[PDB]
Subunit: 224 residues, 2 copies
């Protein structure tokens, strides 16, 4: 039985370090689990102004916000109220690499709210690279590949940051999703994503995000 | 001018998380910079007993402890008293991966002591893997390849953990060393390492380490 509702709140707190630079970011937002859309307003409370591209942090700021068709098992909505946690490695093509974790649960009060405890760490970003030079524009849309492995769910996605000077900067995502209770496991499937920074101040101490995500089973066998 | 001396103290504090499990470890030790040897006694003060193999943490607990030949530029000893920091990615063959950083400096009270601030994070370690099942025996010796890249020093090394059931579990290290001041840069070279846990209690809440390291220029051209 699912306890998810159409309108739910989001509370997040991220603590981390990139190339040794420590920072803390908090935020509040809301989302529509069944429509696969969400928003969050972020505020850098420690470590600002960040010396690296804020874009590397955005996907860390919940697959429960995905419109899942009836035919596909929803690993995430089943996991609540207890919730689930995820672990992720984000390997950039120039050697830079980030690891992040998020422990998600719903508040015990009927406030329909998700609480997110996030840790984010990145290292080996070249001083003259697009991340430390803040030359990123946005993440392109993507299609995450979902598959079960040893009783848990994995999601791998080829990501790409559009650069200011044109061209792309690739990053390979490897995520492991772990429900806090036994839930039905889904067959191999996909999750399309579109996420962007809808607003931000000069130094990105204030950032607004938006994401739209939908699950599917890939292209039909027959054309048209 | 180097301010390094033959006998120096070591103080370390590591804060981290592996597969979401938080922990804090502190330690005290000593080393001989010129002989390339060092020891450290570690104590898990938070998060114990650790659910993962302690071996994944040991290389995080200073390349200043390497016997460098006269003919090879020593990037590390030159950096003090200011010091240097390092960043490292440790990619295991089964997908597990760890990142760590260490900010190293010398105390300014004349106590000949290195202070180390370490952050360690690991994710994607399979529940049935040797790390989460604590089936590791030790790290084999190694030879780290040192090369300059964009004004800083990189060190890459093929590492391997001997497993209890026999066989090895490989990990590729990619480290970036950054001096806090301008120092002479070295030519491509190598650093041989031998590190081991010389003592530990049942759950590894108490662990003693030892490392021996020496730099060199590789095999001579002639046999
Ligand atoms: Mg922008
Ligand atoms: Mg042992
Ligand atoms: Na399914
Ligand atoms: Na040299």
């Amino acid at each position: 039985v699912s306890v998810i509702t159409s309108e739910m709140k989001i509370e997040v707190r991220m603590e981390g370090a990139v190339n040794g630079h420590k920072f803390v970011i908090t935020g509040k937002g809301s989302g529509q689990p069944f429509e696969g859309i969400q928003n969050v307003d972020l505020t850098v409370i420690e470590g600002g102004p960040l010396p690296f591209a804020f874009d590397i942090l955005t996907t860390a700021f919940n697959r429960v916000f995905v419109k899942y068709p009836e035919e596909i098992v929803d690993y995430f909505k089943q996991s609540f109220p207890e919730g689930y946690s995820w672990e992720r490695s984000m390997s950039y093509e120039d050697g830079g690499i980030c690891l992040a974790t998020n422990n998600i649960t719903m508040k015990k009060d009927g406030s329909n709210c998700f609480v997110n405890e996030i840790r984010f760490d990145g290292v080996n970003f070249p001083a003259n690279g697009p991340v430390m030079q803040r030359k990123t524009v946005k993440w392109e849309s993507s299609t995450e590949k979902m598959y079960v492995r040893d009783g848990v769910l994995k999601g791998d996605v080829n990501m790409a940051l559009l650069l200011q000077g044109g061209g792309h900067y690739r990053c390979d995502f490897r995520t492991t999703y772990k429900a806090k209770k036994v839930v039905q496991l889904p067959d191999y499937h996909f999750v399309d994503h579109l996420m962007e920074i809808t607003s931000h101040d000069k130094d990105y101490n204030k950032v607004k995000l938006y994401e739209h995500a939908k699950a599917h089973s890939g292209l039909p066998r027959l054309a048209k």
